Design a protein around this nucleic acid. Sequence first.
RNA 1: UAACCGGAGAGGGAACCCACU
Lengths: 128, 81, 171, 123, 46, 93, 389, 486, 52
Amino acid sequence: EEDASQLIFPKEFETAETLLNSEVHMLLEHRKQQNESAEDEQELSEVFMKTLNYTARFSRFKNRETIASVRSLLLQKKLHKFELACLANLCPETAEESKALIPSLEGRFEDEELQQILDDIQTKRSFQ
Amino acid sequence: ANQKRITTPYMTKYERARVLGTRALQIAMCAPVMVELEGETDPLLIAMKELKARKIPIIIRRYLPDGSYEDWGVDELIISD
Amino acid sequence: MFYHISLEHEILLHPRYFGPNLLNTVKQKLFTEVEGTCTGKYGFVIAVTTIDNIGAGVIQPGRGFVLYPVKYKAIVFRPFKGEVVDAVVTQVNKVGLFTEIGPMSCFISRHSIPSEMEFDPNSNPPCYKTMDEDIVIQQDDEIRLKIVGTRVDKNDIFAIGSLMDDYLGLV
Amino acid sequence: KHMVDDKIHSRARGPIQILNRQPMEGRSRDGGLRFGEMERDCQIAHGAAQFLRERLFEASDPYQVHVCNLCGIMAIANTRTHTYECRGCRNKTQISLVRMPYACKLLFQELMSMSIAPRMMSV
Amino acid sequence: QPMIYICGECHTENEIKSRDPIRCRECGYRIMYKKRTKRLVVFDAR
Amino acid sequence: YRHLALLCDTMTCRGHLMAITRHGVNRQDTGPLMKCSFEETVDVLMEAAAHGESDPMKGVSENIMLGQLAPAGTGCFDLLLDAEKCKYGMEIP
Amino acid sequence: KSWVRLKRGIYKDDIAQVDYVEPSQNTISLKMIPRIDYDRIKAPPQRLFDAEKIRSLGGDVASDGDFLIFEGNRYSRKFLFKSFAMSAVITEGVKPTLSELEKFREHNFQPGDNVEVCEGELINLQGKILSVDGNKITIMPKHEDLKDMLEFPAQELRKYFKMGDHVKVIAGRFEGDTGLIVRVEENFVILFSDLTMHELKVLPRDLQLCSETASGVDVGGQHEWGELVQLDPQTVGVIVRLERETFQVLNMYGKVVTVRHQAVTRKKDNRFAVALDSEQNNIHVKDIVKVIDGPHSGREGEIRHLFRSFAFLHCKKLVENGGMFVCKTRHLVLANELIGQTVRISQGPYKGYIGVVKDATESTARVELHSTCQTISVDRQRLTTVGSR
Amino acid sequence: SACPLRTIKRVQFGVLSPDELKRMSVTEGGIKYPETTEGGRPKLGGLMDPRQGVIERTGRCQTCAGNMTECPGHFGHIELAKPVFHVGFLVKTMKVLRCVCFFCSKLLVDSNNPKIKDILAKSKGQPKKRLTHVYDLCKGKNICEHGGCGRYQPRIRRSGLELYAEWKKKILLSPERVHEIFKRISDEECFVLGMEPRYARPEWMIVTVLPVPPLSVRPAVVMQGSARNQDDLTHKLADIVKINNQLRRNEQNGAAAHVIAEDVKLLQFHVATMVDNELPGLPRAMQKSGRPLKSLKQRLKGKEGRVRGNLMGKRVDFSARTVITPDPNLSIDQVGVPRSIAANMTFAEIVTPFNIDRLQELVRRGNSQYPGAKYIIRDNGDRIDLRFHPKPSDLHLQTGYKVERHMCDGDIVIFNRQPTLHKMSMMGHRVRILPWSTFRLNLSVTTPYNADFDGDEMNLHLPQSLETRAEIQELAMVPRMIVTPQ
Amino acid sequence: IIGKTVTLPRRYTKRDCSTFLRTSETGIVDQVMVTLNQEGYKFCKIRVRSVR
RNA sequence: UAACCGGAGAGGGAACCCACU
Ligand SMILES: [Mg+2]
Ligand SMILES: [Zn+2]
Ligand SMILES: [Zn+2]
Ligand SMILES: [Zn+2]
Ligand SMILES: [Zn+2]
């Protein structure tokens, strides 16, 4: 029903706080830690483990302080929440690829400014 | 608050009938019981022993006709019977 | 996708399961049913962060079980139609490409894959490949794909991927 | 001619009519007794509300029907595949299930047949 | 297999097979009767 | 005298006389389905629908025809479970 | 070589092929489908002429090889070939369909649909349908980035739909289906239908957009999709696909067959039946089991049906037949005489009575007495079977 | 079944708009065939459709997946060749017509008036009272004041069923003209005339579409294999669609307009008969069976109608009835019942470990013996009967099951005599078993019952729910209500 | 009491039309009757005797 | 050198008259 660009959804869906791959990774590892502790406890869902594996193999930052730095540094500039989350999950190194993947980002910012933002993201990315 | 008690503390026959029936219902489908019993099989006698013991884990929400509601616990509700 | 929004769902407490720990029993019960489920409005239920509040118990007239109106903050996942997400291939087949986006399953037809991105049955692992063998999509490989159609059936969300557009394939 | 053998009968959940899901009439078909209007009013005067409700709704014709929260109209439901839809809304989210008497439901179809709109919103 | 029937006004016996006109063989009388069962009957005297 | 005076004051409580007729009870706005449950049904429902009438069914027989619990005593109030005395509840077997 | 319809007789409103036209302008020769019972019921649906059957039945019949005369000079060859009146036939406004052609343009635009302009100075313009007329619509389209309200006919417009939307087939073999498109070519549009994840190649003219998905039930309202019927009184089958006159059915042994609509009969499904999967845990309908042995080894699915040693399983990941595969249960892992007979009560409180057994149990029996206007219960040990058949 | 259950708060009453009617109709393009069905198969677009609902036993609805009980019905629409109005709406229509102008369709009431403001302020939330007040004050207006036309405006009055407008010259009220001027009635004009615009409209008072109800509303029954028994609702629907097709074809090709007007008048009479068969202005319809047709207005205004004979008083089970017999040897609170009544009457019982052995004993004793059960119901809702003697694996029991068991002494039953003249006429009693087959009771209970044993039979209801049984025991019992309040 | 088969328009045949003695009446069949109507159809009449 | 399969819901209705309370 809803497209990614025009993005019609209720106000609850708008005020829903998005999450990073790394944020989901650290939160799900935390929740798995309380699941492993406090025994005689029902185990979490296979959906929970599948999401944990997907977000662990697609996590971009391995440090919580790095995650907070990325979120603050993309936060002070005016961007949409969904486009911000999509950019943080993809981490594209080129503005052309970014605007090709996200059509709603076309015309949102300048090309050189978007490329500078992507270059900053690449520099502050935690590489293994 | 404990001051705004407009309705009477005398709980009514309707209230005692409803609480007796529902108490007998979960006694019948085997919720735990906290009044001591002398040995009975029927939830009607178990529920009336509970009602005369005045130890029910149910509080009654009375709808005052302005739109507001008031809660009355069975312990502070004085029984007409 | 991953959204941190509060949800409210009604929980029915069986009277034989009252016990001493009413709140703890209800919380353990709620963590049993609500996790791993799906709905049309909110998608997959991934995790519940906090239980916001527990409402007052209301005994249903003529029904033994008591209902507790419980609101809780949770994390849910919801893919968007007309939206691109990176994915991991589960299986490659004669019929098409099967992939997983987290818990959500997506399928790609050979009319959705590029025509050059063609399958080799002679290869021992089933994989799509090009004529120049530059792009080879294997099982458990990180690819990107444009989701073009989302549909739900019996509270299960599964999608169709599209790769006619450029910059679509293995990451 | 008034013999007790000819007069005595009793019913326990026999047949139901085609038009309405209600018991038969007359002991030849093992008929049901009419819990009539003034008897219902006198039960009201006694105050046995739960007894009257069980005598009037679920021991006679209990039903369950879906209504959406947007407009108070009937919504269709394929419950085998759990697809619930209100035409004119296409919401499928702001919906609810309520317990409904069969006779009053047929009354609602008669209302819309007479072009009455009993807009029946859940909240 | 065929039924043993009684004419009534003739007080006579006849044999009738199914899907046949219900007529006496010598007079064709439409009022027509069936004989008592061969299955045993008892009655306690109460 | 309680019931007799109650009948007469309910008769005269609307600022004027109330003969027990359709010709009065249709004029008081006391519920479209009360009016339908009176001897005239189709006209009073059809006028309520024609004028677009709202009804929260604070009556009794309206609750009855909807099949749910009528709030007219023994069902007028709500029941709430007490978790404190429930946790005081000892186990039984 | 034209087509008409008859006015009178038992053959009213039936398509007949004018083969030869007599120059006398009185009667014309028609090839027609006989609505006859071959002199069996009369002392009627359309069906092919059976010369051998009507010769076997006899009666008014004359045999001349392929040519035959029957029942008041009714002429048939190979198909009735009979002369009929010019005033009794209608030679204008017949238009036989493809089924009638096998036996012997149109414009349909609806509001809410999207159509594109492919020619003229307004080329390649997609707009929503607001109105529709007969031949020259002069539509009012809602074009993208164009608030001006243009005009286009149905010949200029083409039913173009954006990628990934719910589409419906108005008519054809794939009619009544709902799905999501895969790739739009110039004439061929391929879609996966929703109830059957199956590839349908349809035309844009046959395509239509609507918001109500597939109901999953047949045209006759008798059988749904993914259903259980009887191929034959020993082997049951599962309808896995509905078709315009047929059903694609998976059999008991995993073979996909095609049967007629009336060929199979619905069987009562035991929803409380139980089965065992050789590892001694109970399995039921709508339970997730992994298939570890057999042709479908290493798979997993939900149980749709249970037979006394067999199981019908659904998997979404298997695109074939809607994941529907059947296998034996033992390769899965979880993830009276006395009725109607004269008897005697010959021992006890009712000694000496004669009764008829209406119900018999393992231990006692019900006896309707012959003396007292009452029926009682009495034990089989005290029973005695006198007389009988 | 994924939808949560809800309790109800409010209802709104309006008219159905034709666009919404043709939207929520499952029929697309309407139905336009006077045939009921095809010769061999059910027909789509005829009088009966599978899209309308489930047709036969062990069949499926075309729209929903339900069957008979689970199929709740689906609706349809029929576009009319000419718009038509009916009674009730006709009377309110002519009231609105006398309120409104004829030519310019202006308000004509001059709402910028202190009288109008006072009427609104008094009837804040009284739409019918506001309508009566504005009609009374606007009856004496004649010419327009605003209204551009200076004509006197015609007096519109009914002649039987049709309406004529006569100028100070008489003409027929065309339904198209009435629909047009009701459409030209503005929204603010509608609100100041005092009727809610969002839920109803003056141009919704006139209708151009017929909503058709499902086969639940019009059942199809088979008798001796004939299956030709169809109801007068179906017959009148066939007449309506046949006349509508005739009008549509005639306006398509002929348009001689005289046959059009005359057949439109007959179609208007037909839909008026659909509203009510009995009309003071026109004779009722006629069937070949010799009986008058039954309309829905009659079907609800009758004493056997839905509102009274099916809503206020409806048929109920769990209710025996037989003649009584004096008996002084039992107490005033007890009633004795026959063994056959006690065997054919059931009572629901929860399986608890306190009495599980006795319930198991009663179960394998079973039906057709007096202490026994006839139905066993599991936790999931599986209903298993005992009269066909299932396997002992089925006869095995666990805690929490539902037992339809024969009652014994001590159970509470309600017991009455029609008419219930006084509220003392229905008392609760404890059931007991005596050999001979009649009701046994006390003279101290006959005295309030107005009972005197000359062939008067009583009714005996037994509640199934335990809380209903408890509340009957504790409210309607004879010692608890020895003394009357009146 | 009376068994009749009505032919209707695999391995299934004409439907059952079996008229019963009414529920909760006992006793003995005393005499029976077979004749023809004015139409020519067969017509049966069975009397039920019940001592009280 | 082969092995324990089981099956029960109902079909009109509408009018008139009589009788009983
Ligand atoms: Mg008397
Ligand atoms: Zn809606
Ligand atoms: Zn003779
Ligand atoms: Zn349906
Ligand atoms: Zn004017």
